[PDB]
Design a protein around this ligand. Structure first.
Ligand SMILES: [Mg+2]
Ligand SMILES: [Zn+2]
Ligand SMILES: [Zn+2]
Ligand SMILES: [Zn+2]
Lengths: 108, 157, 62, 97, 45, 289
């Protein structure tokens, strides 16, 4: 399996809003168990009076949402880190190895 | 200069293909566009699918970094086959490439004009540069399994 | 994680014979002799029972 | 549609090349050894050109005593009636116990 | 009905217009998200 | 030219350990039956699950892989249709012709840690039940962790996935016949015969304790190690024991893993080998007449 992370900072003012992006909750974060596709919104971050400036996925990132945390330091800013989980089977391009240096890509 | 209409993938071994033949999977061939002008026969074939997909019959350039000698830029005929996002070719054809299948990638350049398509299967393709002009002899010799089999067949007796 | 239910090569089900393997390993039996009492003759279905880490007893504390 | 295709070669008289779709080595090895048991089959062999596709190719070069088309039903029914004799022998042996 | 559990405090609190993030009967600033009762499906093959 | 006549002899027959001989046939009848019995005969297995709530330690995609490898029983395995052959019912439910339902529900509220078992899966149809010792463990729940899902099992061919194959180890051997040259046995001494007996990996060659003769006992356990022939080859008696495999008279050691019976495995194999060789000659019959 693979577990990734997508961190962002928030510091008129920038908040964690709805920016209205299909499977999203009211606080700008996807619920646990939503299969996130590519080119979608993983963090709902906007401003007042409808000013949407968020972070979107690339065309090589996918997976489902497992957990999302919220934290804040003593400066007065909040933090967010959405974690994505994907289980990957060994395909025809994975590279194995050994205990003696006999590395090799899967052929068939 | 960096150029468009290219692709970069790792390669694996497949002795089921021909000599001047490679294999592009469906996920790459369903996105790479190759332009070709309209003809009188396929007027009902292009309008029901100019910008068409990478079908069979086309040719693309092959390249392994870095370019060692002149014969490391062979243009081979494409052939689509269902594979999980990896390309494959004949392991006896990797002798001009001077690379193994331990993780080496292959650069792929795709032409679009007809003047860059007819010139590929005339001076660049594998059926034309069959003479290794650095040495003056054959270029595509026997591989690893075929050499041992051709030895054992004639020595075992 | 936990012991797999089937063997990775043969296909014989071995997910149930894990509690009775630790129950026979609690005695003075050898690891090479505790598998003969579970009717395993090939070395394909014996390396699963002989070499397997029990990570769930470390993962259940929290 | 058209699972079995008939292709007749021209350069060799009384010669054919049978091919089927969506099969494996379970038929190309059970038809070749049945054709080799016959005395009117001088050439019998299966070949998988591409394992990514699913299509075997069987080539039959027979003599002038019979057609290469009539030497296929005699090799199919020779297994279709042998499997019935194997089933009738196993069903009594499983009923003995 | 979005919930937000505490880090090691264990108090469930709702985060609406949360300029600062801390649970009520606690002092830490770590808030995990609670899994809802959504229905997902994953095949074995 | 015409067909053959194979002869069998069952040695022992119990559940999932059927052992029978197969005489007067070549290797392409004992191999093209093993290749069907190990991958082609269809059973039922859990394909699609639907997890409602999961609060255990393991992930929600690690359990869906483990739940599909449970050896469910299958008595109506050949009489049911596939998911693609059944265009009706739109999936997702007990159609009673192409699918079946399962209901897992458990929650640990006590102090000690209880683990769920394969005997907790309750199905709506009591003819498709997991076999059962202790049972197959899935998760281990602490005080406050629950698990509830809903599984759907369907008939599938074991060529697609390795969960539908009901044969773990089905193999066959050639059952060779060995011969001992009695005219050259008296050349070697007693210690040479002792050193020739102890050179075999398996118990193939014994010794008569009244006359000191090499007597063949249990010749079916040679396993082709080629250690007895090479021992006498580098000695003072070459060509003493000549071992050659027979072209016929094989033996089968099948295993049916508790899903189907061992008697019904080789019956459903030869009942499908009669229909795999059926659509070939009727589709090539119009080109003959
Ligand atoms: Mg390399
Ligand atoms: Zn095993
Ligand atoms: Zn707290
Ligand atoms: Zn159905």
């Amino acid at each position: 399996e693979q577990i990734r992370s997508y961190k962002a900072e928030v510091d008129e003012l920038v908040q964690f809003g709805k920016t209205h992006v299909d499977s999203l909750e009211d606080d700008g974060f996807p619920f646990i168990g939503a299969n996130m596709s590519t080119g979608d919104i993983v963090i709902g971050r906007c401003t007042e009076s409808g000013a949407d400036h968020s972070i979107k996925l690339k065309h090589t990132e996918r997976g489902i949402v497992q957990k999302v945390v919220l934290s804040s330091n003593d400066e007065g800013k909040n933090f967010a880190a959405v974690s994505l989980r994907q289980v990957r089977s060994p395909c025809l391009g994975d590279k194995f190895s050994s205990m003696h240096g006999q590395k090799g890509v899967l052929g068939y | 200069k960096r150029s468009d209409h290219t692709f970069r993938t790792v390669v694996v071994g497949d002795p089921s293909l021909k000599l001047n033949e490679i294999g592009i999977p469906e996920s790459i061939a369903k996105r790479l566009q190759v332009s070709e002008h309209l003809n009188q026969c396929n007027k009902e074939r292009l309008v029901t699918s100019i910008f068409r997909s990478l079908m069979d019959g086309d040719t693309v350039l092959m390249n392994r970094p870095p370019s060692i000698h002149q014969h490391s830029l062979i243009a081979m005929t494409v052939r689509i086959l269902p594979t999980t996002s990896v390309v494959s070719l004949n392991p006896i054809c990797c002798l001009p490439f001077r690379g193994d299948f331990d993780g080496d990638c292959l650069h792929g350049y795709v032409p679009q004009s007809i003047q860059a398509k007819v010139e590929l299967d005339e001076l660049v393709a594998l059926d034309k540069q069959l003479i290794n002009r650095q040495n003056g002899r054959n270029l595509l010799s026997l591989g690893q399994d075929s050499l041992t089999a051709a030895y054992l067949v004639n020595v075992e007796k | 994680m936990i012991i797999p239910v089937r063997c990775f090569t043969c296909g014989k089900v071995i997910g149930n014979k894990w509690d009775q393997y630790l129950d026979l390993l609690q005695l003075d039996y050898t690891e090479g002799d505790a598998l003969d009492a579970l009717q395993l003759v090939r070395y394909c279905c014996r390396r699963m029972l002989m070499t397997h880490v029990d990570l769930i007893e470390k993962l259940l504390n929290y | 549609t058209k699972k079995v295709s008939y292709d007749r070669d021209t350069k060799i008289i009384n010669a054919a090349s049978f091919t089927v779709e969506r099969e494996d080595h379970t038929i190309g090895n059970i038809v070749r050894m049945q054709l080799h048991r016959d005395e009117n089959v001088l050439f019998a062999g299966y070949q998988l050109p591409h394992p990514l596709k699913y299509k075997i190719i069987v080539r039959i070069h027979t003599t002038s005593q019979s057609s290469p088309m009539q030497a296929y039903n005699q090799a199919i029914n020779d297994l279709d009636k042998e499997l019935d004799y194997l089933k009738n022998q196993f069903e009594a042996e499983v009923a003995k116990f | 009905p979005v919930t937000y559990v505490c880090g090691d405090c264990g108090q469930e609190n709702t985060l609406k217009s949360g300029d600062v993030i801390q649970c009520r009967e606690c002092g830490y600033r770590i808030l995990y998200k609670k899994r809802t009762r959504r229905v997902v499906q994953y095949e074995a093959r | 030219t015409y067909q053959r006549f194979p002869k069998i002899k069952i040695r022992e027959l119990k559940d999932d350990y059927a052992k029978f001989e197969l005489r007067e046939t070549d290797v392409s009848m004992a191999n093209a039956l093993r290749r069907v019995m190990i991958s082609e005969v269809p059973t039922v297995a859990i394909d699609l699950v639907e997890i409602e709530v999961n609060s255990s330690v393991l992930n929600d995609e690690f359990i869906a892989h483990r739940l599909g490898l449970i050896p469910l029983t299958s008595e109506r395995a050949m009489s049911m249709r596939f998911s693609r052959d059944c265009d009706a019912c739109d999936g997702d439910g007990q159609c009673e012709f192409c699918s079946v339902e399962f209901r897992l529900s458990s929650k640990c509220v006590t102090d000690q840690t209880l683990d769920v078992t394969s005997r907790d899966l309750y199905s709506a149809d009591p003819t498709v039940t997991p076999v059962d010792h202790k049972g197959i463990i899935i998760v281990k729940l602490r005080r406050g962790q629950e698990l509830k899902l809903r599984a759907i099992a369907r008939k599938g061919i074991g060529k697609d996935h390795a969960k539908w194959s009901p044969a773990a180890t089905v193999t066959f051997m050639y059952e060779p016949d060995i011969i001992i040259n009695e005219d050259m046995m008296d050349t070697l001494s007693d210690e040479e015969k002792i050193d020739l007996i102890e050179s075999s990996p398996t118990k193939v060659f014994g010794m008569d304790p009244v006359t000191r003769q090499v007597v063949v006992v249990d010749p079916e356990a040679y396993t082709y190690d080629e250690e007895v022939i090479k021992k006498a080859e580098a000695m003072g008696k070459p060509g003493l024991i000549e071992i050659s495999p027979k072209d016929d008279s094989f033996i089968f050691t099948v295993e049916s893993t508790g899903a189907v019976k061992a008697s019904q495995l080789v019956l459903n194999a030869i009942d499908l080998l009669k229909q795999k060789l059926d659509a070939v000659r009727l589709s090539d019959d119009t080109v003959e007449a």
